[PDB]
Amino acid sequence: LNLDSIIGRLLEVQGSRPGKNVQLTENEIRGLCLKSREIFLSQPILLELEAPLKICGDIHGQYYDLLRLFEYGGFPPESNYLFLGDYVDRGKQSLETICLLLAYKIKYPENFFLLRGNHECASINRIYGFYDECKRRYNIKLWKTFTDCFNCLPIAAIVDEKIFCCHGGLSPDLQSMEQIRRIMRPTDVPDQGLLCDLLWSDPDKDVQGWGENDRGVSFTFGAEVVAKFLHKHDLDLICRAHQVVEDGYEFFAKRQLVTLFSAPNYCGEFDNAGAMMSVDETLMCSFQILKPAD
Template sequence: MNQLVSETLRGRTVLKDEDVWELSGVLQDRYRSEKNVVEVDADRLVFVGDLHGEYECLLSVQRLLDDYNGHLFVFLGDYGERGPLQVETFNLVAAMAVGYPERVLMLRGNHETASVATRYGLYSQVVKSYGHSTFRHYTSAFSVLPMALRTKHGVFACHGGVPEGALSVAEIDACSRYGEELDSSVLYQIAWNDPREGDFRFRPNQRGGSSRIFGEKAFREFKEGVGFELMVRAHEVFPAGVKPFFSGQLQSIFSASSGGQVAPKVLRVGPNLDIEPINLA
């Protein structure tokens, strides 16, 4: 394993500009050629929701790697913004993704774009510690992160949820994610959309942009088209840290405390699609 990666995994948080460039480079090498929807055989997984710069929560997740040996850990995006240690949080997840490529998968959330990261905090934390050009190494890393995961045993996972305009993995894979922004409307919505109960397809979303609210009708059509039984997503704060939708066919997970609003959790999914929320103590 690369020395910088192993030191970051062991808790080194102070990285020089050149270190960030190197870490970004190895992360890009790891993910550039992956499809938008990564397909895996794993049937035991641990899903990690938004971290938003809460490095302590990430350290709790890192400790679970040993307890849940044999599980694939899937990070659903939103590493920066809001919390105190955004740069450190992104760096450690990146080190986990390249240090344990068979055990850790890093997906792209709506905060992994240049515009959102500039407006909401990561940019200011990066330029406080590094030169402006180093921010570009972060946005280059964002641009390669895959958008979603599908497992053979029937899980589909992404940051936001069901997009309007795609009903198959092939249609999602046909879009391009390689940019600082999510220019594809389908990929943008996979990172931004939110579920709500009700037998409708799509409604406007107060988050703005071209984000949508998806209802059970859209969920059902997407589930049949893509071919899965359980969707796991993140993106929204719920006090319990986990919230089911559509009779439990969709689970929303959040892994940061958000200033004490949330009891942060990760979600274990087993071989029979059995689920177990795990507290991040």
């Protein structure tokens, strides 16, 4: 496995000008995929987690921003982490990003957690850059190995029976958490239905109930849908990612839902900050912001 060597080489560029690649061997990356896959399958598809925990949204291959997130938030195992998905695509360094994340999952499997985003799906990351990065830097076979791994990622987490976490959001079909738990892995993400919605849906302040999603996939949901869901399941907050938000976090439905996004100046086409949410042992939630310098 060579795990500590791999981690050392990934972190070697901490002091370099951003953009410098770390080129691990094919056999190394394959080992990270196969080992992390076993671990994902051995843990529930619906994670049950306890505070303290730091929660992060999309990274999208912005490897140097991930390094800063750990710098400021505390490198594993100093802090426990839950990432909400979308590790790959769009950025130039999806490989370094996912390899570091998988390496920490392997090293600290009970204190480090990764959910599946909509971009951890072959039909999406084929198109938005990850396949290209794999083909350019390695080979297509390695992209298929990543797919096999991503197909085993858990889909949602509940923090201290009070914070429901997923990449996208709610589903009109979600009535019982057992619907999530009965999902068998490995699985692809379908074009519609519960699993699709969990990875694809968005809150909309302008919709009453459920509406159509501008993305062409899944749905939008209003503030009342959120309130009803939380009351039903005795939950306090939905924590999700999946949308660029200017300050890195943004509340919805008063403070019943939060969106976290952790890729600052997203693909150089937005001027946003990234953020992470800390949950302490008393379940106090706070925000830390990552803002690009001027």
